[PDB]
Structure formats: structure tokens, C-alpha cells
Amino acid sequence: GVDLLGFLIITLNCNVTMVGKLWFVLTMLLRMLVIVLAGRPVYQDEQERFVCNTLQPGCANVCYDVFSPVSHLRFWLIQGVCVLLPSAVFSVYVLHRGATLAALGPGLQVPDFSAGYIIHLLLRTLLEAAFGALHYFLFGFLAPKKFPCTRPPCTGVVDCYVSRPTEKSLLMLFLWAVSALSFLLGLADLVCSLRRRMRRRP
Amino acid sequence: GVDLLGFLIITLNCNVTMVGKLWFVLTMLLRMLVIVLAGRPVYQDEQERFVCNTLQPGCANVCYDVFSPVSHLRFWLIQGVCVLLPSAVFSVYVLHRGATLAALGPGLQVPDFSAGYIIHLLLRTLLEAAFGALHYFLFGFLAPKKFPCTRPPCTGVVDCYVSRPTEKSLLMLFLWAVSALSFLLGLADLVCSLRRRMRRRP
Amino acid sequence: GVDLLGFLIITLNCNVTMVGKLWFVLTMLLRMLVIVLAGRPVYQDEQERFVCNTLQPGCANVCYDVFSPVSHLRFWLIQGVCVLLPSAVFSVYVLHRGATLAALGPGLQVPDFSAGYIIHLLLRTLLEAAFGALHYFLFGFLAPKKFPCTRPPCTGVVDCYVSRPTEKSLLMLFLWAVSALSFLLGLADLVCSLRRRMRRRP
Amino acid sequence: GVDLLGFLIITLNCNVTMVGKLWFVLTMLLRMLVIVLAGRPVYQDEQERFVCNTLQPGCANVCYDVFSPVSHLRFWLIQGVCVLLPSAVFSVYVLHRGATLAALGPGLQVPDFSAGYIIHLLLRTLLEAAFGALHYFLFGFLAPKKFPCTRPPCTGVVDCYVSRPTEKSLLMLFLWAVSALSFLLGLADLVCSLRRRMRRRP
Amino acid sequence: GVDLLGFLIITLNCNVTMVGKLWFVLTMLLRMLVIVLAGRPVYQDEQERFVCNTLQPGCANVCYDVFSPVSHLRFWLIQGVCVLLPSAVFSVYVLHRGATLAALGPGLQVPDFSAGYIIHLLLRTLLEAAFGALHYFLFGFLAPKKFPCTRPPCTGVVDCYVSRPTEKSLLMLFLWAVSALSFLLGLADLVCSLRRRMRRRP
Fold first, then answer.
1. Do C61 and D51 touch (CB under 8 A)?
2. What CA–CA distances, in Å, run from B55 to B50, B67, B158, C61, E152?
3. Of A50, B107, C3, E155, which has the fewest CB atoms closer than 10 Å, so is most exposed?
């Protein structure tokens, strides 16, 4: 005996575990906020102050283009969005299936969206290992200090100096630690919400 | 027997299909977020580091002005806004026609806004083909690496070097793939929500 | 027989026409979003790359200061805010007069805020003609391509080159078209919501 | 006979006058939006283009540091936040005292938070005169056009040119007018909500 | 006898004291807003205008990298996020335990989340002393005005000039004062919400 803004929050809370909620808080307060606020200013002058020891115009542009085919700030952003996509698709599905069932009508009788949670957890877990492997195989662990350049529109070999590599290496380690910690939180929910299912099935 | 914050969400959910909701999520989490967050920093120094091999002041300004009459970041933003406009006009219309009917008053009796959905889908689908054609005929597929300039306030032919073309070409391909995938989602909803209409009409 | 979050949306929806709602959508999705997102990056380097053919320090600063006493981005922002102010004052007034009347108490009995709509429409319409006239008399229709400078801390006449004038001229024409189209929407509501009033008064 | 999302808006609306609501709208739509959106771009290159007629490195840095100990954009932001703080503390107090009283329980019986309004108005009014006096005694009314510098790491007296002083002086006058107009709105509410109190006390 | 959007706000308000609410307002209106809005522009050109008295390319990059291993803006942001994390975890826990208990069902009967408040307060208080100690031992109290550099890719000892140190020193003192004031607010809530607990236990 509740209103429509009643049994529309219980039907979404009772189908998600506390571990998932705290994972959501951790993944949106320590990952999607640090990247936007403290990641953009750091990588604002990666090309402006990429000083190369040369004088022929155009050597610096190609040298920088060869040095970094794609900066890892965009890699972090893409990985963060692709991790959060399944957590939104499932929420939309739950809302659609919960707000349409009350229209027909008949101490609560909330639906049971449990079979749609394990698949979501599996997809989210699988989407992180591939991204971690790509991160390791593309960017390594720490940024380099100087780069040698040989692609000639210019004459010779030009050694260029990277800008503020220590802070970049610190931020990379921080994000690595955050992702590693968040992987275990999502792995512990799949092994706990699946052993709690076969128990309640005589 | 529901309140006003009751039969004001069902009357908006029952008139939109799950395909449309997931298209909305995809078009606002992978298109309107990537452009704002990762598109602005990339195109921040397109003119600052457009190095030209010349010394007469003023050759660089006109050469850049001839090179790019309009950058494609603004094109992407305009296309994204113009695609989402019909999806907001219909929502406003539904809210206006749903919150006014309950004022008069008489196991639910929700209205049927189905004839106003096919027209919206047709307009949204038609608004994307023209923009795709314009994108292909204006910007091509990949960015160039060097530009020749002849418009003289300066003396001769000046070859200028574009800044970070590889990352720009990667982002353009990503956005092309996203738009191509989103077109089929909007096309499959029109062919499914129209065959499901003539069935329920004896 | 509704709650307080009941007859507090009808009392605000029944007093505003569909034309006004779609005008609100149009002038907040195509005017206040384009200016913020695509207007700031364009006018970010108007002074940084205002190249002048001189060598005496300080000629460029005064030449730019004489060239543009006030950029038109701030003009657009001020006009946009001053247009939207009346649409918020009336909403605040309606909420204040609707949430205080239900406290006393006595198939609905919603209030009639119609006399307070024509005055709002008249003020909003009058606030746009003056701004349009100021825009035409201050900035013209197209940006110039080069500027002559004579105010001497420097020696002679210095011709400076403006940065990316074609894109600026395209954006300003787009904004002109948007404002011109929005003026007629606000003019057609005053002539329709006033002829529909004298009819219902025997 | 209302819900909790019922007698939680009347208990906040009935304790605030229309003058206060319109002052809030004016102070958050014409003061906290202009500063953020149009104040940040103007003061973005105050140091980048502070051209000084010298050649010894380091003279420009100290000359700029002596010229502007603190820019007035931060002064405006601090004043704006410190003005709005009392208007939020009182709202939090009202919510806390209104949501806890309905738990115990017993044509409405709304509480009377009037003695807590005059003190808030007095504090808000007193917090603006001091800031106005500080603004006048620190920044004056109009920005200067050129600055003489004598603090030597360099040799001699160096005259530097300020960047775009006319637009800065226009924005300063606009903000001065806005603050002066807003002071009277807060002064007229204290003299009206206090004469309307002794009347209703036989 | 309330709805679900009823006994879901009382169960969260009655478990938090007014001191905590005003601390939240203070630590989100004077700490998380000043840093984002007035902290980013100040530290935007810390490396761009770090002038060094040398001519060999690459000396400036390493000199700046040695001078500031990590800027204190990121330190402030990390400390602010880590302070607010416990205040969000507890809120999520309260919502989860309050929205699930009403599903089963049985002048109010709100739960008592008091034992879960002292632990949260203790963790939040302990998380600030360590950060304050780190701030003192890493950045001191005032920024320096000039830096000597000896790490050679360059020849000799190079004295570089910091950019706008006075404003940085003023902002750092302001943030120090804000943090010091906020520490006592969180300390006085633990000593008051613990003496008020043993009283109500015969």
C-alpha cells in the first residue's frame, strides 16, 4: 500500500547489494572526479613545453606526434566511461520493468531482478581485465624522462625533454592502485551474490 | 488511485520503448560526454602550434584561416544538439498533455501517445543522414599531415605542419563508429514500433 | 484531493502555454548551450594571436584595446541572461502564490495566473528589440579581416590581422538567425494568449 | 493532513518573503553566473600579456607581483560566497527544525521561524558594507592603463602596459551597480519584516 | 502513517546533528568551491612563467621538475576528497538500511543509527591530522620567491623566479585557517554526541 514514488526505490535498492553501492561511491568519487579535476590541468601543456634541441621548424611537431600517438588521459576517460556503461544499462532496465508492472496492478510484492545482476557483474568484470592489459602493454608504469627522435624533416637525431614526469608518474601509480582495488570489489560481489542464490532454491 | 507524482511517470515510461531508453543512454554517455571532456583539450591548440615555414607576419593567420574555415568540433557539437532536440520536444509535449488531463479527472487509464512517436522517430532519423552526408563531404575520414599555402600577403608557397593528426584521426574514427552504431538503433525502433501498431487494430 | 507535490505542478503547467514551453526549450538548448560550449573556445585567443606589424613594445596592447572595447561574447551572455530573468521572476512569483494558498485550505480549484502572464510576455518582448538594435549598431553583421591602427605609443600606422574571422562570422550569423526565430515565437504567444482572454469574459 | 514531502515546503516558503526570493534570484542569476562565465575569460591573461619595456629576465615577474598583490576576481568570488553563506545556514536550520518536529506528531499548524529571520538579515546586511568599503579602499573604481616599476632586480624605471583595461573597467562598474542595487533589496526587507512583527503582538 | 518518501528523510535527519550539517555546509561551500573556482586559475601558469636565467634548452624543465615534485593544488584536492569520503559512505549505509527495513513493515518508529556515527566521526577526525602533518612537513607555510638550481644538463647554478608568490601565500593561509576551523567543528561533535549517549542508558 504505497504510492508510485514508493515501490520504485525499494524495487531498485533491494536488487543491489551494499558492496555494489560502496563500489559505485568509490568509482565515482575517487576515479571520475580525480581524472576530471586534477588530470586535465596536468596534461594541459604536454605539447606546449615539449622542448627539443633543434632549430628547423617542423621537427618538434613530428617528434611529438611520434612520441605520443595517443595520450593516456583520454585512455583513462574512455576506460572509466566503458566501465560505468553496464551499471547504467541495468538501472535503466530495472526502472523500465518496475514502472510498467505497477500499471496493471495485482507485506510487499517487489519483483526479483537477480538473474539480471550476475550477467551485469560478469560483463563489468570482464571489461576491466582487457583494459588493464591494454594499459600495461601500451603505457607501461612510469613516464620516461627524455626521448630520442630520428624521423627526419630535420637533420640528425634530436633529444627532447618531457615536461613534469614525476607528477605524471605519481598520478599513474595512484590510478593504478585505485583500479586494482576496485577490481577486487567487483570480483567479491560475483562470488558472494552467486553462492547466496543456490542456497535459496530447494 | 495514485498521486500526481504517480500517473506522471507511467504516462511517460509506457510511451517509450526500451530501445529508445538505451539509445538515449548511449547517445548521452558515449557521445555528449566524450566530445565535451576529451574533445575540448585536443582541439585547444590547433592554431597556437600551426607552424609555418615563413617569416613575414600575417602569412600564418591567413594560411590557417584558409586551411580550416570551421573546425569539426563545433560541427560535432551542433550535430549532437540538433539530434537531441526532437527527443526533448516530444518529452515536453507529453508532460504538457499528461499534467493537464489529470486536472479535470474522470487498473489504470494512461493516455496513448503512440501516433506522436513515429513522427518523432522519422524526424530524428532524417536529421542524421543529412548531417552524415555533410560530415563526409566536408571533413572526409582522416586529417592531413601538412598543408600548402599560396594566398599571398607573404611571398611564395608556404608548407605548414598540422598538430597531432594521429590522435585527431583516431577520435574522428571513434565518433564515426559511434554515430554509425546509433543510426541503426534509431532505425530498428521505427520498424518495430510500427509493425506492433497495425496488429492492435481490428 | 491531491498532496502538496500534487497541485503544485498543475498550478504551474496550466498557467503556461505549449508555445512558451517549446520557446524555453529552444532558448536553453540552442542558445545558452552553444554560447557556453562553442563560444568560449573560439574567443579564447583573440588577443594572443592579434599579430601587428611592429616592433615597439606596447603598440599591440593599445591597438587591441582600441580595436575591441568589449568583445561580443560578453554581449551575448548578458543578453541571454537578461532575456531569461523575467521567465524566472514569474516562476518564483507563481510558486510563492501557489504554495501559500494551499496552507489555509478550502474537479480541481487551481488558481488563475493569467493577468501576470501578459505583462511578463510584454516585458520579455520589449527587452529583445533594444538588445537587437544595440547589437546591430555596435557589431554589425560580419567581422573585419584587418585593422589599421594610429594611436601612437608607436611610430606610424600599423596594420594588424584578426584571427579566424570566417568562423566568427559564421557563428554570429547562426546566433542572429536563432534570435530572429526566437523573437517571433515570443511575439506569437502574446497575440494568441490575449485574444483567448477576451473570449472568456461575458 | 499532508505527507512529509508536503509540510516541508510550506514550512520553508511561509517563513521567507517574496522580496527575499527575488533577491536570491537576482544574486544567483546576475552575480554568481556573470563572475564565473564572463569573469574568468577576461582575467585569464593578466600576467601573460603584461608587457614591460625591459630585457633583463625577472624584472617582469617582480613588477607584476608588486602591481597586483591579489586580483579582484578572487575578491569578487570570496565576497559572493561570504554573502550567500548566511542564506544557506538559515535554510539548513529551518530544514533541521522542521523535519524533526513532524516525527513526534500532534487548517495547518506550520511553525513560526520569524525571530530567526531578522538576525540572518542583519548579519547579511552587515557583511556587505565591510566588503564594499574594502573594495573601494583596495581597488578603487577604474583600472589603470600603465604602471611604473622601480623594485630592482633590473636596472632603472620600467613602464609596463596593462592588458584590456577598458573592458575591465566596464565589468567593474557593472558589478558595482549590481552590488549597490542588491544592498537596497536586503535593506528594505529588514525594515518591512520588522514593522510587520510588532503589529501582530497585542 | 507516511509514504516511502516520508520515513526516508526523518530516518536520515534524526541521525545527524545540526553541528554536522553546518560542518557539511562549511566544508562544501568554503572549501570545495574555492579550490575549484579560484585555485585552478592561480596555478594555471606555474610552469609557463617559471623564468630561469639561462640559455641552454632543457635546463628549465629539469629545474622546474626538481623545484616542485607535486604541486599543492592536487594535494588540496586529494585531501578534500578523502575527508568527504566517510561522510558519503555512512549516508549510503543509512539509506540502504532504511529503505530495506520498510519493505517488510511492522508516533514514529524510526531506526537508531547512533553506534554507526561515532566510528564515522573518529575516522573523519583521524584522517585530518595525518593530512595536516603531511601538509606542514611538505609545503611549509609560505611559498618562496626564488629558487637556486644545480642539477646540470646546463652549465652552472641557475637562479629562477617564482610566479606571483604573494597571492599563493595568501590563498594557502586562507585554506590553512579554513581547515583549522573545520577540525574543531568535527572534534566538538564527537565529545558532544558521546556524552549524550551514556546518559540515555539506565
1. yes
2. 14, 18, 10, 22, 34
3. B107
